[PDB]
Design a protein around this ligand. Structure first.
Ligand SMILES: N#Cc1cc2c(Oc3ccccc3OCCC(=O)N3CCCC3)cccn2c1
Lengths: 544, 407
């Protein structure tokens, strides 16, 4: 226990403590329990109690033995607390120190006192053999294992205990994490060990044991799935399994390790490997490794072959981020201050059918958010797009977009606008009046056009939708026209898709239309109300 | 002095909103501001038994100002502290020639805050890279941005303002959160002097303020049909399409005489003279659209919705409505900065201008449908925010095919 002041705690509004029942337990267990509760009572962590306490909580025992108290019922009744840290610090954002020491406090929660007026609700009962002698009543004086309050209270106690030491030692950096401390310094190694030894003495005066140099751990460090080395970091070694049959569960785990590895191994792809999991319900259904997925899995194995490492942060050097396109809504980026070492890497994939420039902007945004979290600043951007390309797109795009400080990098693939529609209709160009229509029941439909020069066509269509025929019409007019064409449609849908100027889509039709749009020289698309008898349009809806 | 007790709506628990990550520069500025505030008693540090939280920001001038987003605590409290302690909105403020906004938030900081309420004002200064859990405070005095603050202070305010109101029975003064809106009909020169009089009145009564709108033009702008010498088939098609979209708001538009004027499947650049029967519709429809709509009344029990559209070359259009197609106000914000402005700066000024107009006209702010990617806005909006309130907002998914229909 410790002379730390207690944090006051309340039960949830309108509620009383847990009055659960203790199921009878076997004989050799009832023995090994009291062999713990007499030791814990001696050390002041518990205290036998009278009959006046009406609450109780179950207690179990499990492999020397070990005591265990299911607090899940009391956890449902205690007030809520400030949430402990959700995320953890990222290695790419530590600043190099001359020396780092790792200290872990034992019996952590038991070394911290529990608020007095709340100790009653922790009562428990060791049962008598053959349910006869009254039960041995108890209760906690310290932070019980697995209680809702214990982590947040321990955190702030530790934080308060560190205060008098941090004030006498402003040159040294302590990180808190659950039950660890990570102490860094730029002191010469003899000074550093003395400071560590006087930190431990301080923490010992407040009732917190820590390991001596006989067991104070040493680089490299295996922390939360990383390998932290004196002047570099990497992920802990990844193991991609080789199986002939792959379960839905197993694909998830594989995508996990692949995402995990992507923070430092550049160029991991996960598009095809998770397209698999798109239609998932059952966790155990075996899935065929499609051909495209198997290629990506093989290419990831290639990248993971040789290890690679990241560096740590230096605040005096610039922060640079560089972006490359991978090919199918797939993007990869590196963050660095030096030309042969990265701070970290990662990927952006777009779900939901955009174009390259829109996607590039979303990737810049993701990186900006991440930079801020990790370093507290935004990087300069090196981007594979010409300024004039980009000024053209953002000036005409319906959304507002922020373009940060960036400069062009001439590494293919470049990001470009592939075609552009016209702003006003073309002269000396044939004017096609297209329309289309289907039947929701039969899935039969037709697409056709009518031109000002009296040309006409109608094509039959099976297995289609009013949406798909309206796009089919526009494809027809693009097929049967010259290098300049005016198209006139009564469909805001099809007008929406093309005016968005995509360069790829998850529907094969829209891809063919994009090809024609590249081939053509000037294409003006124009819109009129359907079924309003405008003229030109009234004659094509009749045909279709 | 005695504290006004403050209760939440029954069954409503306190705010638990997540704190955004911030620049190191913003973090440091906040740590400075809060170190002085703890020093003057205005706020105090709290333990983990306080679970509530409310986001905080840093904005500007050259001083960093701190800005607490109290939107969630406002819904959970002031919605009963607009009934129990409401401040009535004067319908004659929109009529005055000149309206000046004066910041009086500094008055609240003397007055203590109800002891049992302080827990719900918790906020966190965040740390970079999750190094530390965060620095946690709660208010001991009435906070800026909380709507219950000027509610509680309203009696003091009505008292300090009463001598000024007697010598100036023609000057309307409305309090909305931290600001006094003051409207006169005086010439600009007299009104300005009259503003300095009220500054000096407030300053000799112990309210410092750290130191112009014309709600005469404020209306629903009329729709503009293009004025053309000659008309082509494409022009008639754009005209027929716009006029058909207007029929949803101004019923009584007629187009049959205009549709006949494109009877055969002509080419798209073919000029077609307008018939007399055609020019009759264009004239008869240009007049039914210069006159305002019928049936369009503000409902105080509904929420105002603002929609903004980007238009090009620093021009933005907006409409404020409660029901589709019944616009209570429309306008056009144009930022003149000479390519020293980007879209995000312009959208931010637009939102602030629309919100102030909405405050003057109705005493309420709208919820904005913003044409911008969410994370982009969540990252840069504070860069140009100058107001002390924050409207509610959300993000538009699909573009408008109705773009030039408001230009
Ligand atoms: N197990 C573990 C572990 C260690 C650290 C950690 O070390 C630091 C502690 C205090 C200041 C800077 C630090 O890191 C400096 C960067 C550095 O040169 N190194 C060398 C090996 C460890 C990192 C910080 C955060 C989490 N930790 C988790």
């Amino acid at each position: 226990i410790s002379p730390i002041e207690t944090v006051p705690v309340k039960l949830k509004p309108g509620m009383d403590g847990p009055k659960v029942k203790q199921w009878p337990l076997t004989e050799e267990k009832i023995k090994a329990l009291v062999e713990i509760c007499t030791e814990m009572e001696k050390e002041g962590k518990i205290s036998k109690i009278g009959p006046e306490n009406p609450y109780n909580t179950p207690v179990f025992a499990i492999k020397k033995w070990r005591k265990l108290v299911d607090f899940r019922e009391l956890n449902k009744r205690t007030q809520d607390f400030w949430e402990v840290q959700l995320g953890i610090p990222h290695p790419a954002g530590l600043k190099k120190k001359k020396s780092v020491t790792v200290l872990d406090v034992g019996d952590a929660y038991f070394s911290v006192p529990l608020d007095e007026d709340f100790r009653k609700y922790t009562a428990f009962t060791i049962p008598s053999i053959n349910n006869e002698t009254p039960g041995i009543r108890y209760q906690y004086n310290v932070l019980p294992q697995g209680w809702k309050g214990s982590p947040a209270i321990f955190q702030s106690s530790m934080t308060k205990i560190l205060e008098p030491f941090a004030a006498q030692n402003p040159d040294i950096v302590i990180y808190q994490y659950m039950d660890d401390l990570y102490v860094g310094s730029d002191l010469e190694i003899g000074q550093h060990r003395t400071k560590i030894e006087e930190l431990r003495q301080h923490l010992l005066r407040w009732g917190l044991t820590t390991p001596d140099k006989k067991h104070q751990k040493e680089p490299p460090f295996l922390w939360m799935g990383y390998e932290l080395h004196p002047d570099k970091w990497t992920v802990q070694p990844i193991v991609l399994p080789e199986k002939d049959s792959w379960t839905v569960n197993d694909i998830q785990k594989l995508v996990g390790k692949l995402n995990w590895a992507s923070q430092i191994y550049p160029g991991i792809k996960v598009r095809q490997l998770s397209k698999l999991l798109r239609g998932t319900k059952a966790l155990t259904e075996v899935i065929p490794l499609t051909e495209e997925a198997e290629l990506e899995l093989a290419e990831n194995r290639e990248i993971l072959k040789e290890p690679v490492h990241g560096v740590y942060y230096d605040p005096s050097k610039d922060l640079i981020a560089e972006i490359q396109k991978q090919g199918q809504g797939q993007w990869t980026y590196q963050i660095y201050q030096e030309p042969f070492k990265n701070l970290k890497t990662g990927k952006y994939a777009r779900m939901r059918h955009t174009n390259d420039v829109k996607q590039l902007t979303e990737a810049v945004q993701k990186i900006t958010t991440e930079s801020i979290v990790i370093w507290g600043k935004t990087p300069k951007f090196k981007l594979p797009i010409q300024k004039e390309t980009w000024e053209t797109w953002w000036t005409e795009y319906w959304q507002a977009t922020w373009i940060p400080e960036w400069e062009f990098v001439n590494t293919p693939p470049l990001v470009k606008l592939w075609y552009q529609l016209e702003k006003e209709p073309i002269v000396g160009a044939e004017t096609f009046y297209v329309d289309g229509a289907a039947n929701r029941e039969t899935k039969l439909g037709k697409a056709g056009y009518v031109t000002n020069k009296g040309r006409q066509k109608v094509v039959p269509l099976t297995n289609t939708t009013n949406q798909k025929t309206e796009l089919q019409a526009i494809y027809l007019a693009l097929q049967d026209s010259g290098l300049e064409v005016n198209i006139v449609t009564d469909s805001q849908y099809a007008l929406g898709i093309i005016q968005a100027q995509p360069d790829k889509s998850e529907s094969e039709l829209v891809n063919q239309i994009i090809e024609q749009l590249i081939k053509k020289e000037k294409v003006y698309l124009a819109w009129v109300p359907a079924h309003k008898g405008i003229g030109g349009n009234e004659q094509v809806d009749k045909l279709v | 002095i005695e504290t006004v007790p403050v209760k939440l709506k029954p069954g409503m628990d306190g705010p638990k909103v997540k704190q955004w990550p911030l620049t190191e520069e913003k973090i440091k500025a906040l740590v400075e501001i809060c170190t002085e505030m703890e020093k003057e008693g205005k706020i105090s540090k709290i333990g983990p038994e306080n679970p509530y939280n409310t986001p905080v920001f840093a904005i500007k001038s050259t001083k960093w100002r701190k800005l607490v987003d109290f939107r969630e605590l406002n819904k959970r409290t002031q919605d009963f502290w607009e009934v129990q302690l409401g401040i009535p909105h004067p319908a004659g403020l929109k009529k005055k020639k000149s309206v000046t906004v004066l910041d009086v938030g500094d008055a609240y900081f003397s007055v203590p805050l109800d002891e049992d309420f302080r827990k719900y004002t918790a906020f966190t200064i965040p740390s970079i890279n999750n190094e530390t859990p965060g620095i946690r405070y709660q208010y001991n005095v009435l906070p800026q941005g909380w709507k219950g603050s000027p509610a509680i202070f309203q009696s003091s305010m009505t008292k300090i303002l009463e001598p000024f109101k007697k010598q100036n029975p023609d000057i309307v003064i409305y309090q909305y959160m931290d600001d006094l809106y003051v409207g006169s009909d005086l010439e600009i020169g007299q009104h300005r002097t009259k503003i300095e009089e009220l500054r000096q009145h407030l300053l000799r009564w112990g309210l410092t303020t750290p130191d112009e709108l014309h709600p005469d033009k404020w209306t629903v702008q009329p729709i503009v049909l293009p004025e053309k010498d000659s008309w082509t088939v494409n022009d008639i098609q754009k005209l027929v399409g716009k006029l058909n979209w207007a029929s949803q708001i101004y019923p009584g538009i007629k187009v049959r005489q205009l549709s006949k004027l494109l009877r055969g499947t002509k080419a798209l650049t073919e000029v077609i003279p307008l018939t007399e029967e055609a020019e009759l519709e264009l004239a008869e429809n240009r007049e039914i659209l210069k006159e305002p709509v019928h049936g369009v009344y503000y409902d105080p029990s509904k929420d105002l919705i603002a929609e903004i559209q980007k238009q090009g070359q620093g021009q933005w259009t907006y409409q404020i409505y409660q029901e589709p197609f019944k616009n209570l106000k429309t306008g056009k914000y144009a930022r003149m900065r000479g390519a020293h402005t980007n879209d995000v700066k312009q959208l931010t000024e637009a939102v602030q201008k629309i919100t102030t107009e909405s405050i003057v006209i109705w005493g309420k702010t709208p919820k904005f449908k913003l044409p911008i990617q969410k994370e982009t806005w969540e990252t840069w909006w504070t860069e140009y925010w100058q107001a002390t309130w924050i409207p509610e907002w959300e993000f538009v998914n699909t573009p408008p095919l109705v773009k030039l229909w408001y230009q």
